[PDB]
Structure 1
Amino acid sequence: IKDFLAVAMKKWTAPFEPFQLIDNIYYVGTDGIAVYVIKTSQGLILMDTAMPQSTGMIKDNIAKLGFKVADIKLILNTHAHLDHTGGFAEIKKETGAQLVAGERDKPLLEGGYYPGDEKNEDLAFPAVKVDRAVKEGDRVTLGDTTLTAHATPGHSPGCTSWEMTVKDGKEDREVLFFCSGTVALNRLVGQPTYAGIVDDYRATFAKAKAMKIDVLLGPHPEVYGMQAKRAEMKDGAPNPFIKPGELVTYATSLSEDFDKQLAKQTAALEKK
């Protein structure tokens, strides 16, 4: 946790210039937390926020593109940890937007706590009410734009990956805002962070490998190597964010890391 907090006041708060990523999806996060605006014909969708102390920064980034924070109608969450939820209560109150999140993450959101470590104030965030609790396959529509919820638990109990279609020239491309599949601070064994966590992770890796996704996105830019792609982006060159093999490759890496951490945490149960 100490190192988690160290990273959270370093790459996670460092600037990154907002940009149009593909079609109606805009990057407005930091160098280390990815946040998105999705422009629809009936207002904006905000996909996540960042650390609680970074809300003004995210609002400023939205402005740099000429979007209005006031025009946010829906706030969607990938998963309910403070580095993604820290601005929800504030932006919701300022805008009147509705918050949409995976049903099993509702208790987290509504209590502002880290599951299985509820007394840790360093992982707390301002509590926020969930307006629509989603399940696998639910469709969330604003104007011309529809995202589909995919239940991909593990990193959190209600982790939701959100799929949408965009255009690249005349052709459709499928985008996935992947929710996260890292072990990170979670306990897998002993006193697991929540019941059924291990089966959820391995179900999620399998699910992720079976999806047909052209553009992998996630809640940190390292999920999809954002910075290297942004540097390659040129008017009249293919959009570097289109890499259809990427979610299978990434979920394979996550599964291998999972196995290593499950084995480390299992070895650590043996009390010396």
Structure 2
Amino acid sequence: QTIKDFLAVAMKKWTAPFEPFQLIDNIYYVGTDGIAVYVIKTSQGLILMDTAMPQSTGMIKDNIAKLGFKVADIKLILNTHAHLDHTGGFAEIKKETGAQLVAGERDKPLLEGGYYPGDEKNEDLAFPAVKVDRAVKEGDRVTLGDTTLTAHATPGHSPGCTSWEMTVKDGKEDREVLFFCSGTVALNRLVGQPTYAGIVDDYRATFAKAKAMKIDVLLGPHPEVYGMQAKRAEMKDGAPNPFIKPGELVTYATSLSEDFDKQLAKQTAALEKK
């Protein structure tokens, strides 16, 4: 991986438009073609799940309005993890709306500083700093009106990476949704000068945890996590909701664990003096 390539991709597919849509029950997709953002409609206002790159905040606000929502009705902002491709609009939206920001406790310093962990002087990974109103840990519950989400600590990709669980209806039946936080290696350093202390252990705890969770609908902060576009194509009035795939988090976490092993080996070999 190169940071140049990360930025190149980040300034292309990550900023390209995608038509917003009702995904399941009160969960609506309002992200880009490469970064997933969601509105959760409650009886007491909107919950915003993540934002996108700093340059894309206007696009996200536009997508919200395209669905008939008001940006002003956002009361809570939740974060999966504190990297600029997910936090770029937090300061702006929080100021505009007066919403409270909720995030994993170990990501609080990242959010409040607007920097990438272990690469804190890199301005192309910086974002506008934002205050955290509530810092969460494993099992904490966050409620707006009729809707409650449960925090799960799934560190590795960031130290405070938080996967959020909530129940939706599919017809008469409950289905459990996870907004998985990310388990990719991406720009992180695993060995040598690791991005943060204990990162390797965190990733492997997270892959195992993910495989053991009872989840009907896998979501995530990039559409690639759950094959969003292919599922959207299969949506049809009266047909089963294609986002319900209860074995998918096991399959996806297995693919992540296998890639993790590859990247750990690669970085370990790269540390050898040549």
What TM-score results when the alignment is normalised by the length of structure 2? 0.99
Q: Unpaired runs of 5+ in structure 2?
A: none
Cα distance between partner residues in 1 of 2:73 and 2:33: 25
Q: Unpaired runs of 5+ in structure 1?
A: none
Identity, % of aligned pairs? 100
* Cα displacement string for residues 219-265 of structure 1 (whole angstroms, at most 9, x for unaligned residues): 00000000000000000100000000000000000000000000000
- What is the root-mean-square deviation of aligned Cα atoms in Å? 0.2
Aligned residue in 2 for 1:174: 176
Cα distance between partner residues in 2 of 1:63 and 1:271: 54
Deviation at 1:271, TM superposition (A): 1.5
Cα distance between partner residues in 2 of 1:91 and 1:147: 21
Secondary structure of the corresponding residue to residue 158 of structure 2: coil
Aligned residue in 1 for 2:158: 156
Cα distance between partner residues in 2 of 1:136 and 1:270: 37
Cα distance between partner residues in 2 of 1:232 and 1:134: 36
Cα distance between partner residues in 1 of 2:17 and 2:130: 26
Cα distance between partner residues in 1 of 2:8 and 2:168: 36
Q: How many residues align?
A: 272
Secondary structure of the corresponding residue to residue 264 of structure 2: helix
Name segments (4+ residues, structure 1) moved above 3 Å.
Answer: none
Cα distance between partner residues in 2 of 1:239 and 1:261: 35
Deviation at 1:192, TM superposition (A): 0.1
Cα distance between partner residues in 2 of 1:23 and 1:110: 33
Match of 1:106 among 105, 108, 115: 108
Aligned residue in 2 for 1:270: 272
Secondary structure of the corresponding residue to residue 186 of structure 2: coil
Cα distance between partner residues in 2 of 1:269 and 1:222: 30
Cα distance between partner residues in 2 of 1:14 and 1:36: 16
Aligned residue in 2 for 1:186: 188
Aligned residue in 2 for 1:77: 79
Cα distance between partner residues in 2 of 1:265 and 1:102: 27
Matched, 1:4 2:3: no
Cα distance between partner residues in 2 of 1:68 and 1:239: 26
What TM-score results when the alignment is normalised by the length of structure 1? 1.00
Cα distance between partner residues in 2 of 1:271 and 1:8: 32
Aligned residue in 2 for 1:247: 249
